[PDB]
Design an enzyme around this catalytic site. Structure first.
Site, mmCIF file in Angstrom:
data_model
loop_
_atom_site.group_PDB
_atom_site.id
_atom_site.type_symbol
_atom_site.label_atom_id
_atom_site.label_comp_id
_atom_site.label_asym_id
_atom_site.label_seq_id
_atom_site.Cartn_x
_atom_site.Cartn_y
_atom_site.Cartn_z
ATOM 1 N N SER A 141 11.324 -8.736 -28.948
ATOM 2 C CA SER A 141 11.409 -8.110 -30.272
ATOM 3 C C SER A 141 10.463 -8.701 -31.306
ATOM 4 O O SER A 141 10.228 -9.905 -31.334
ATOM 5 C CB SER A 141 12.845 -8.178 -30.825
ATOM 6 O OG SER A 141 13.743 -7.389 -30.058
ATOM 7 N N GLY A 165 14.101 -10.658 -26.339
ATOM 8 C CA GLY A 165 13.204 -11.803 -26.386
ATOM 9 C C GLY A 165 11.812 -11.370 -26.821
ATOM 10 O O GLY A 165 11.054 -12.155 -27.397
ATOM 11 N N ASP A 199 12.798 -1.605 -39.663
ATOM 12 C CA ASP A 199 12.790 -2.876 -38.935
ATOM 13 C C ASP A 199 11.403 -3.499 -39.026
ATOM 14 O O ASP A 199 10.616 -3.448 -38.085
ATOM 15 C CB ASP A 199 13.163 -2.639 -37.473
ATOM 16 C CG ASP A 199 13.689 -3.894 -36.784
ATOM 17 O OD1 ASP A 199 13.998 -3.815 -35.575
ATOM 18 O OD2 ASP A 199 13.805 -4.950 -37.446
ATOM 19 N N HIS A 233 15.249 -7.421 -37.908
ATOM 20 C CA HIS A 233 16.458 -7.781 -37.150
ATOM 21 C C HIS A 233 16.428 -9.171 -36.502
ATOM 22 O O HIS A 233 17.472 -9.709 -36.131
ATOM 23 C CB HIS A 233 16.827 -6.707 -36.097
ATOM 24 C CG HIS A 233 16.149 -6.858 -34.766
ATOM 25 N ND1 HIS A 233 14.987 -6.197 -34.434
ATOM 26 C CD2 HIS A 233 16.512 -7.555 -33.661
ATOM 27 C CE1 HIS A 233 14.664 -6.474 -33.180
ATOM 28 N NE2 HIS A 233 15.574 -7.297 -32.691
HETATM 29 N N1 LIG Z 1 13.972 -1.079 -23.748
HETATM 30 C C1 LIG Z 1 13.262 -1.949 -24.465
HETATM 31 N N2 LIG Z 1 11.970 -1.850 -24.422
HETATM 32 C C2 LIG Z 1 13.868 -2.896 -25.390
HETATM 33 C C3 LIG Z 1 13.167 -3.356 -26.544
HETATM 34 C C4 LIG Z 1 13.762 -4.271 -27.442
HETATM 35 C C5 LIG Z 1 15.085 -4.772 -27.204
HETATM 36 C C6 LIG Z 1 15.685 -5.749 -28.062
HETATM 37 C C7 LIG Z 1 16.982 -6.282 -27.731
HETATM 38 C C8 LIG Z 1 17.610 -7.491 -28.240
HETATM 39 C C9 LIG Z 1 18.954 -8.029 -28.596
HETATM 40 C C10 LIG Z 1 18.506 -6.889 -29.482
HETATM 41 C C11 LIG Z 1 19.383 -7.231 -30.676
HETATM 42 C C12 LIG Z 1 20.344 -6.418 -31.368
HETATM 43 C C13 LIG Z 1 20.813 -6.856 -32.650
HETATM 44 C C14 LIG Z 1 20.362 -8.073 -33.187
HETATM 45 C C15 LIG Z 1 19.659 -8.972 -32.397
HETATM 46 C C16 LIG Z 1 19.185 -8.548 -31.165
HETATM 47 C C17 LIG Z 1 17.780 -5.699 -26.689
HETATM 48 C C18 LIG Z 1 17.189 -4.732 -25.828
HETATM 49 C C19 LIG Z 1 15.838 -4.266 -26.054
HETATM 50 C C20 LIG Z 1 15.224 -3.321 -25.198
#
Ligand SMILES: N=C(N)c1ccc2cc([C@@H]3C[C@H]3c3ccccc3)ccc2c1
Length: 245
Positions: free
Chosen positions: A198, A196, A97, A46
Protein backbone atom coordinates in the site's frame (compact mmCIF):
# COMPACT_ATOMS: atom_id res chain seq x y z
CA UNK A 1 3.85 -8.58 -4.47
CA UNK A 2 2.45 -12.04 -5.35
CA UNK A 3 4.50 -13.66 -8.12
CA UNK A 4 6.71 -11.22 -10.03
CA UNK A 5 10.50 -10.95 -9.80
CA UNK A 6 12.95 -9.91 -7.13
CA UNK A 7 14.57 -6.59 -8.08
CA UNK A 8 16.90 -3.92 -6.59
CA UNK A 9 16.52 -0.18 -5.94
CA UNK A 10 18.45 0.97 -9.01
CA UNK A 11 15.44 -0.39 -10.95
CA UNK A 12 13.04 1.72 -8.78
CA UNK A 13 14.97 4.94 -7.73
CA UNK A 14 11.84 6.89 -6.64
CA UNK A 15 10.55 4.15 -4.33
CA UNK A 16 10.41 5.21 -0.69
CA UNK A 17 10.32 2.62 2.12
CA UNK A 18 8.47 3.85 5.20
CA UNK A 19 8.88 2.37 8.70
CA UNK A 20 7.56 3.26 12.15
CA UNK A 21 9.31 3.52 15.54
CA UNK A 22 7.42 1.72 18.31
CA UNK A 23 7.48 2.62 22.00
CA UNK A 24 10.44 0.53 23.14
CA UNK A 25 12.72 0.79 20.12
CA UNK A 26 11.42 -1.86 17.70
CA UNK A 27 10.84 -0.84 14.10
CA UNK A 28 8.45 -2.46 11.65
CA UNK A 29 7.78 -1.80 7.97
CA UNK A 30 4.63 0.23 7.20
CA UNK A 31 4.07 1.14 3.53
CA UNK A 32 5.84 2.30 0.40
CA UNK A 33 5.69 5.74 -1.18
CA UNK A 34 7.14 7.69 -4.10
CA UNK A 35 9.45 10.71 -4.40
CA UNK A 36 7.65 13.72 -6.00
CA UNK A 37 10.27 16.43 -5.47
CA UNK A 38 13.42 16.47 -3.31
CA UNK A 39 11.39 17.48 -0.23
CA UNK A 40 8.19 15.54 -0.92
CA UNK A 41 7.00 11.91 -0.84
CA UNK A 42 3.43 10.93 -1.69
CA UNK A 43 1.66 7.83 -0.32
CA UNK A 44 -1.75 6.67 0.93
CA UNK A 45 -3.63 8.20 3.86
CA UNK A 46 -4.82 4.79 5.17
CA UNK A 47 -1.18 3.94 6.00
CA UNK A 48 -1.04 6.71 8.65
CA UNK A 49 -4.57 7.74 9.72
CA UNK A 50 -4.47 5.60 12.92
CA UNK A 51 -1.03 6.87 14.07
CA UNK A 52 -0.92 10.53 12.83
CA UNK A 53 2.17 11.58 14.85
CA UNK A 54 4.80 12.61 12.33
CA UNK A 55 7.66 11.88 14.75
CA UNK A 56 7.30 8.06 14.71
CA UNK A 57 8.03 7.62 10.99
CA UNK A 58 11.33 6.75 9.30
CA UNK A 59 11.68 7.09 5.53
CA UNK A 60 14.37 5.50 3.38
CA UNK A 61 15.36 6.26 -0.18
CA UNK A 62 17.70 4.04 -2.19
CA UNK A 63 17.15 0.99 0.05
CA UNK A 64 17.03 -2.50 -1.55
CA UNK A 65 16.42 -4.82 1.39
CA UNK A 66 14.09 -4.82 4.36
CA UNK A 67 16.78 -5.32 7.00
CA UNK A 68 20.04 -4.30 5.32
CA UNK A 69 21.79 -0.98 4.73
CA UNK A 70 22.12 -0.77 0.96
CA UNK A 71 25.15 1.22 -0.18
CA UNK A 72 23.91 4.64 -1.21
CA UNK A 73 20.76 4.81 0.94
CA UNK A 74 19.70 7.97 2.81
CA UNK A 75 17.60 8.07 6.02
CA UNK A 76 14.98 10.77 6.83
CA UNK A 77 12.33 11.91 9.31
CA UNK A 78 8.97 13.57 8.53
CA UNK A 79 8.83 17.39 8.81
CA UNK A 80 5.15 17.71 7.84
CA UNK A 81 2.53 14.96 7.52
CA UNK A 82 -0.45 16.10 5.42
CA UNK A 83 -3.48 13.83 5.17
CA UNK A 84 -6.47 14.46 2.90
CA UNK A 85 -9.20 16.18 4.91
CA UNK A 86 -11.98 14.25 3.10
CA UNK A 87 -10.57 10.71 3.53
CA UNK A 88 -12.96 7.89 4.56
CA UNK A 89 -12.97 4.07 4.56
CA UNK A 90 -15.88 1.73 3.84
CA UNK A 91 -16.05 -2.09 3.94
CA UNK A 92 -13.54 -2.41 1.09
CA UNK A 93 -13.07 0.94 -0.66
CA UNK A 94 -10.96 3.85 0.58
CA UNK A 95 -11.80 7.44 -0.41
CA UNK A 96 -9.36 10.26 -1.08
CA UNK A 97 -6.58 7.81 -0.17
CA UNK A 98 -3.65 10.15 -0.67
CA UNK A 99 -1.13 11.78 1.69
CA UNK A 100 1.97 14.01 1.57
CA UNK A 101 5.16 13.68 3.67
CA UNK A 102 7.72 16.48 3.71
CA UNK A 103 11.09 14.83 4.40
CA UNK A 104 14.14 16.20 6.18
CA UNK A 105 17.43 14.58 7.22
CA UNK A 106 18.96 15.19 10.66
CA UNK A 107 20.95 18.05 9.10
CA UNK A 108 17.70 19.62 7.88
CA UNK A 109 18.04 18.89 4.16
CA UNK A 110 15.80 17.30 1.56
CA UNK A 111 16.82 14.34 -0.64
CA UNK A 112 19.98 14.39 -2.79
CA UNK A 113 19.39 12.93 -6.30
CA UNK A 114 21.78 10.13 -7.32
CA UNK A 115 21.96 6.93 -9.38
CA UNK A 116 19.71 5.13 -6.85
CA UNK A 117 17.57 8.10 -5.71
CA UNK A 118 15.33 9.94 -8.20
CA UNK A 119 11.84 11.51 -8.41
CA UNK A 120 8.94 10.36 -10.64
CA UNK A 121 6.80 12.77 -12.67
CA UNK A 122 3.13 13.51 -11.91
CA UNK A 123 0.49 12.96 -14.63
CA UNK A 124 -1.30 15.80 -16.47
CA UNK A 125 -4.96 16.94 -16.27
CA UNK A 126 -7.44 14.72 -18.15
CA UNK A 127 -4.71 12.51 -19.61
CA UNK A 128 -4.61 8.95 -18.20
CA UNK A 129 -3.50 5.87 -20.17
CA UNK A 130 -6.18 3.75 -21.92
CA UNK A 131 -7.47 0.48 -20.47
CA UNK A 132 -5.22 -2.45 -21.41
CA UNK A 133 -1.98 -0.55 -20.75
CA UNK A 134 0.71 -2.52 -18.90
CA UNK A 135 2.19 -0.67 -15.92
CA UNK A 136 4.46 -1.69 -13.04
CA UNK A 137 4.13 -1.88 -9.27
CA UNK A 138 6.83 -2.36 -6.65
CA UNK A 139 6.93 -3.08 -2.92
CA UNK A 140 8.11 -5.12 0.08
CA UNK A 141 4.63 -6.68 0.49
CA UNK A 142 3.48 -10.28 1.01
CA UNK A 143 4.46 -12.95 -1.51
CA UNK A 144 1.33 -14.95 -0.54
CA UNK A 145 -1.80 -14.09 1.43
CA UNK A 146 -0.96 -16.70 4.06
CA UNK A 147 2.53 -15.30 4.74
CA UNK A 148 2.89 -13.30 7.95
CA UNK A 149 6.40 -12.02 7.13
CA UNK A 150 7.30 -9.76 4.23
CA UNK A 151 10.02 -10.73 1.74
CA UNK A 152 13.56 -9.60 2.61
CA UNK A 153 14.31 -8.48 -0.97
CA UNK A 154 12.30 -5.84 -2.88
CA UNK A 155 9.98 -7.16 -5.62
CA UNK A 156 8.12 -5.80 -8.69
CA UNK A 157 5.59 -7.01 -11.26
CA UNK A 158 3.56 -5.84 -14.26
CA UNK A 159 -0.26 -5.73 -14.47
CA UNK A 160 -2.75 -4.04 -16.81
CA UNK A 161 -5.37 -1.30 -16.45
CA UNK A 162 -9.09 -2.14 -16.40
CA UNK A 163 -11.82 0.31 -17.48
CA UNK A 164 -14.19 1.91 -14.96
CA UNK A 165 -17.22 0.21 -16.47
CA UNK A 166 -15.60 -3.26 -16.41
CA UNK A 167 -14.54 -2.69 -12.83
CA UNK A 168 -18.13 -1.69 -11.89
CA UNK A 169 -19.57 -5.01 -13.15
CA UNK A 170 -21.39 -7.03 -10.44
CA UNK A 171 -18.72 -9.78 -10.09
CA UNK A 172 -15.96 -7.16 -9.79
CA UNK A 173 -16.64 -4.12 -7.52
CA UNK A 174 -20.01 -2.69 -8.61
CA UNK A 175 -20.70 0.88 -7.46
CA UNK A 176 -18.05 0.51 -4.73
CA UNK A 177 -15.32 1.76 -7.08
CA UNK A 178 -15.78 5.38 -8.29
CA UNK A 179 -14.46 7.59 -11.13
CA UNK A 180 -11.66 8.82 -8.86
CA UNK A 181 -10.09 5.31 -8.65
CA UNK A 182 -8.34 3.06 -11.20
CA UNK A 183 -8.39 -0.75 -11.45
CA UNK A 184 -5.49 -2.95 -12.65
CA UNK A 185 -4.72 -6.69 -12.65
CA UNK A 186 -3.31 -9.84 -14.27
CA UNK A 187 -5.64 -11.51 -16.83
CA UNK A 188 -4.46 -14.89 -15.44
CA UNK A 189 -4.80 -13.71 -11.81
CA UNK A 190 -1.35 -15.09 -10.92
CA UNK A 191 0.40 -11.82 -9.98
CA UNK A 192 -0.70 -8.70 -8.04
CA UNK A 193 0.06 -6.26 -5.19
CA UNK A 194 -0.87 -7.26 -1.62
CA UNK A 195 -0.86 -6.11 2.02
CA UNK A 196 2.45 -4.35 2.66
CA UNK A 197 2.56 -2.75 -0.79
CA UNK A 198 0.00 0.00 0.00
CA UNK A 199 1.03 3.55 -0.79
CA UNK A 200 3.48 2.38 -3.43
CA UNK A 201 3.76 3.52 -7.10
CA UNK A 202 1.74 2.33 -10.10
CA UNK A 203 3.97 3.66 -12.86
CA UNK A 204 2.71 3.77 -16.44
CA UNK A 205 4.70 4.66 -19.53
CA UNK A 206 2.55 7.27 -21.26
CA UNK A 207 3.30 9.05 -24.50
CA UNK A 208 6.99 8.48 -23.77
CA UNK A 209 7.52 9.42 -20.09
CA UNK A 210 7.07 7.21 -17.03
CA UNK A 211 4.30 8.75 -14.90
CA UNK A 212 3.00 8.21 -11.36
CA UNK A 213 -0.45 7.17 -12.56
CA UNK A 214 -1.64 5.51 -9.37
CA UNK A 215 -1.08 4.86 -5.68
CA UNK A 216 -1.63 1.29 -4.35
CA UNK A 217 -4.84 1.63 -2.29
CA UNK A 218 -7.17 -1.38 -1.77
CA UNK A 219 -8.44 -4.71 -3.06
CA UNK A 220 -10.35 -7.88 -2.13
CA UNK A 221 -7.71 -10.45 -1.26
CA UNK A 222 -4.55 -10.65 -3.35
CA UNK A 223 -4.49 -12.10 -6.87
CA UNK A 224 -8.08 -13.42 -6.73
CA UNK A 225 -10.29 -13.98 -9.79
CA UNK A 226 -12.32 -10.88 -10.83
CA UNK A 227 -10.91 -8.80 -7.96
CA UNK A 228 -8.37 -6.27 -9.36
CA UNK A 229 -6.07 -4.05 -7.32
CA UNK A 230 -7.59 -0.57 -6.87
CA UNK A 231 -5.49 2.61 -7.08
CA UNK A 232 -5.92 6.32 -6.35
CA UNK A 233 -6.08 8.13 -9.72
CA UNK A 234 -3.42 10.81 -9.24
CA UNK A 235 -4.57 13.08 -12.10
CA UNK A 236 -7.78 14.02 -10.28
CA UNK A 237 -5.82 15.32 -7.29
CA UNK A 238 -3.36 17.60 -9.14
CA UNK A 239 -5.02 20.76 -7.76
CA UNK A 240 -4.79 19.31 -4.22
CA UNK A 241 -1.13 18.25 -4.60
CA UNK A 242 -0.24 21.73 -5.90
CA UNK A 243 -1.85 23.71 -3.08
CA UNK A 244 -0.44 21.44 -0.37
CA UNK A 245 3.15 21.53 -1.68
N1 LIG B 1 -5.55 -6.85 -4.57
C1 LIG B 1 -4.60 -5.95 -4.30
N2 LIG B 1 -3.86 -5.56 -5.29
C2 LIG B 1 -4.46 -5.31 -3.01
C3 LIG B 1 -3.91 -3.99 -2.89
C4 LIG B 1 -3.78 -3.37 -1.63
C5 LIG B 1 -4.18 -4.05 -0.43
C6 LIG B 1 -4.00 -3.46 0.86
C7 LIG B 1 -4.35 -4.22 2.04
C8 LIG B 1 -3.94 -3.98 3.41
C9 LIG B 1 -4.45 -4.11 4.81
C10 LIG B 1 -5.20 -3.10 3.98
C11 LIG B 1 -5.74 -2.28 5.14
C12 LIG B 1 -7.10 -1.93 5.46
C13 LIG B 1 -7.33 -0.89 6.42
C14 LIG B 1 -6.24 -0.26 7.05
C15 LIG B 1 -4.96 -0.79 6.94
C16 LIG B 1 -4.73 -1.78 6.00
C17 LIG B 1 -5.07 -5.46 1.94
C18 LIG B 1 -5.25 -6.05 0.65
C19 LIG B 1 -4.80 -5.37 -0.54
C20 LIG B 1 -4.95 -5.95 -1.83
Amino acid sequence: IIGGEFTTIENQPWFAAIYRRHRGGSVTYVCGGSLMSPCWVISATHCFIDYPKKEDYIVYLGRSRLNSNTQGEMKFEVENLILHKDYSADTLAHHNDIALLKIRSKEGRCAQPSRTIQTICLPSMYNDPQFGTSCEITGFGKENSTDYLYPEQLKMTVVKLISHRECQQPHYYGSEVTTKMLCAADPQWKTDSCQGDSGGPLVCSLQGRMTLTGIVSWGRGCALKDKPGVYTRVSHFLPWIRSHT
